[PDB]
Amino acid sequence: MEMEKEFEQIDKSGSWAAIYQDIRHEASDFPSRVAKLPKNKNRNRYRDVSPFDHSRIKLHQEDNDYINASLIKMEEAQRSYILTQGPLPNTVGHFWEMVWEQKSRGVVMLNRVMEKGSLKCAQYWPQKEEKEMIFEDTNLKLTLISEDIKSYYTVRQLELENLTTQETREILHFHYTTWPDFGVPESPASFLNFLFKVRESGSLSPEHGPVVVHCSAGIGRSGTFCLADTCLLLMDKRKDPSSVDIKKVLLEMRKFRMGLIQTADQLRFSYLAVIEGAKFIM
């Protein structure tokens, strides 16, 4: 079925939970043996969220190459994404090592450091220009260059230096600051405006490594971001845009990381975002 009328048909029939459970039942199951090794317990935020072995990002390190991060490679759309958990106190150095080694231009953050009164990720970037951060375990230096605070999101320019080689690179940090503590946004308008700002920066384009996107676990809000982006790109590429099937795209992405889209409300919100976004593109 088309999307917008499939949407009204699920609303009127109140069957979002059944649709979402079907997706959960059909989703791929692949091994995640490296994530579950005892030496990696303090590298995982949640015991039930792990990268598959076949798609996990490897650190270029011979001691321990593990990080909780996955490469989502979308062949027809010609887009790739790295989805990862919010960094932990003992993985902030690994996080920036990955950004460096994968040649990423942008980092997309969809959570606040504190939500619901608890810490959802480490404070992993500097908050003042004159107070830079040094990660001694991976030999990197990180400096805040500029910060632009808007009503729904903040954009930061960062300088990452590899202290071994003295090479430097500019990284863009796109921070969506207004996702509610509970539920999903009422309108997708600010989320779509944010997606378009990430696109306009070059951070999603083939001349760079894959964008790094995270929330707390790296599957819920993060899944919503890449699902919406890929579906909108396919609608532009194909002769028949109504042939884009959001459920089929989501199952394809779930071949590369488990659990993408965590609730039926997030599934409905993803439909809404793609529907409204397809009208603005034209």
Ligand SMILES: CC(=O)c1ccccc1Oc1ccccc1
């Ligand atoms: C772009 C800009 O205005 C600027 C000026 C002085 C110093 C740094 C600047 O930004 C950079 C430069 C290099 C990498 C990342 C950001």
